[PDB]
Design a protein around this ligand. Structure first.
Ligand SMILES: COc1cc2c(Oc3ccc4c(c3F)CC(C)=N4)ncnc2cc1OCCCN1CCCC1
Ligand SMILES: COc1cc2c(Oc3ccc4c(c3F)CC(C)=N4)ncnc2cc1OCCCN1CCCC1
Ligand SMILES: CC(C)C[C@H](NC(=O)[C@H](CC(C)C)NC(=O)c1ccccc1)C(=O)O
Ligand SMILES: CC(C)C[C@H](NC(=O)[C@H](CC(C)C)NC(=O)c1ccccc1)C(=O)O
Lengths: 177, 194
């Protein structure tokens, strides 16, 4: 059972964001951090990431939970850490953000849709500008890059190899082991 | 079905159909949802009727649930560009973009039958359009520019201020014939000549 290995790695304080970030994986992932912190508030939690990205709200659930935790969260990029994956990767404890040697990172701006009456779309657009701004503010904070560069580089998909991602600021180390 | 009929004269015999007969009397029929195809048909007719005799009035019978915005502004502009006056007449309903076309007929010549209804509402988007935030910001601006453009042409023809229009179309506003008259959208309510 896939779930038996995942619960064994749980006792080892290892958790996986291995899919698109949606509310169901986020709620599972937020539950796990609450558990583990309840068990030991001084031992680290390892979050391995392999993700296309997904819902920002789902990701903010996870990110805030990561930050309010008593212990440090170590994030590891396996395979792909894209968009919200990249965000959560860069959101782990400084110094404890890792990339495997052949992982790739993708950062870009938010995607969504508009729908409804002109007055409803006007409000949707207010939030597009609010959220975009905050999303860059935070990535600029994780990486150390000026908010002007995050915005410019995020306009269209930018990919980073492990070595490039370490330059930019997404990670602190590249695991050779 | 839609039968055709035969008229005769000493010059000969003419078979035709109701709409043709109407078109001969300079009457256009806008009884469908304004879409691209429809808008083209109506423009074609406006320009053609304007060519045959630009000093005679063109009548548009309107029974429509509205349609797309740029189709609306295609017909609106043609209606305004043409030399001949345009008598607009609401038979069953003129809603959304239809209400704007009803209001846009030349002053004094906008009318409606006693049990007709005019609905006025702001540009909606039933579908979802998707993209990067950068692409949608552009769309939202265009949807806002379209919305306010409807408000100021409506204002131009009802005599009201765009701010009022903008407030009234925030939620759907249904008007009876007499109420549409009061509102500025039409000039007279047709009385039964039977
Ligand atoms: C993920 O979905 C949405 C999330 C939305 C949302 O979330 C956030 C929450 C916390 C948060 C941030 C968020 F952005 C930024 C930040 C910093 N903290 N904030 C505002 N607006 C949203 C609209 C959404 O989508 C609505 C359209 C989809 N509908 C149509 C079909 C299915 C459902
Ligand atoms: C597997 O898919 C994709 C994978 C992608 C990807 O992966 C890698 C990750 C790490 C890595 C290497 C990768 F190549 C080489 C290496 C050495 N290390 N790197 C960049 N771009 C990708 C785009 C992909 O697919 C894009 C569209 C498909 N979508 C659209 C709709 C359904 C699916
Ligand atoms: C951190 C960003 C760049 C990640 C990006 N997520 C999104 O843009 C979301 C994609 C949809 C859920 C499919 N969009 C939103 O969360 C959202 C929030 C508010 C309004 C509209 C859309 C990614 O691709 O991972
Ligand atoms: C925001 C709009 C212009 C986007 C566009 N909507 C339409 O074209 C509507 C037609 C459909 C039958 C809904 N038009 C209107 O809602 C409308 C109302 C009043 C005056 C003019 C237009 C879309 O892409 O769906």
């Amino acid at each position: 059972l896939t779930d038996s290995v995942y619960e064994r790695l749980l006792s080892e304080r290892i958790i996986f964001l291995g899919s698109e970030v949606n509310d169901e994986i986020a709620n599972r992932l937020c539950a796990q951090i609450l558990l583990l912190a309840a068990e030991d508030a001084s031992k680290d939690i390892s979050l391995y990431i392999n993700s296309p990205g997904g819902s920002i709200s789902a990701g903010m659930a996870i990110y805030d939970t990561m930050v309010l935790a008593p212990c440090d969260i170590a994030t590891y990029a396996m395979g792909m850490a894209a968009s919200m994956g990249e965000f959560l990767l860069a959101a782990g404890t400084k110094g404890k953000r890792y990339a495997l040697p052949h992982a790739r990172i993708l950062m870009h701006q938010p995607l969504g849709g508009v729908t409804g009456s002109a007055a409803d779309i006007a409000i949707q657009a207010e939030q597009f500008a609010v959220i975009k701004k905050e999303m860059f503010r935070l990535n600029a904070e994780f990486t150390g890059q000026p908010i002007e560069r995050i915005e410019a580089d995020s306009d269209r998909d930018r990919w980073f190899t492990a070595a490039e991602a370490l330059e930019y600021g997404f990670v602190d180390h590249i695991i050779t082991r | 079905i839609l039968p055709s009929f035969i008229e005769h004269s000493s010059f000969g015999v003419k078979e035709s159909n109701p709409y043709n007969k109407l078109f001969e009397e300079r009457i256009i029929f806008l009884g469908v949802q304004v879409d691209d195809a429809s808008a083209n048909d109506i423009m074609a007719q406006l320009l053609v009727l304007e060519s045959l005799d630009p000093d005679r009035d063109i009548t548009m019978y309107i029974n429509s649930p509205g349609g797309g915005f740029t189709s609306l502004m295609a017909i609106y502009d043609t209606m305004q560009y043409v030399r001949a006056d345009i008598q607009t007449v609401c038979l069953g309903q003129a809603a959304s973009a239809a209400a704007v076309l009803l209001a846009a007929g030349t002053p004094g010549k906008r009318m409606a039958l006693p049990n007709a209804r005019v609905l006025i509402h702001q540009p909606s988007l039933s579908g979802v359009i998707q993209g990067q935030f950068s692409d949608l910001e552009i769309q939202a601006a265009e949807i806002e520019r379209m919305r306010t453009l409807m408000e100021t042409t409506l204002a131009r023809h009802t005599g009201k201020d765009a701010g009022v229009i903008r407030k009234d179309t925030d939620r759907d506003k249904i008007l009876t014939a007499e109420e549409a008259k009061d509102y500025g959208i039409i000039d007279t309510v047709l009385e039964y000549r039977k």
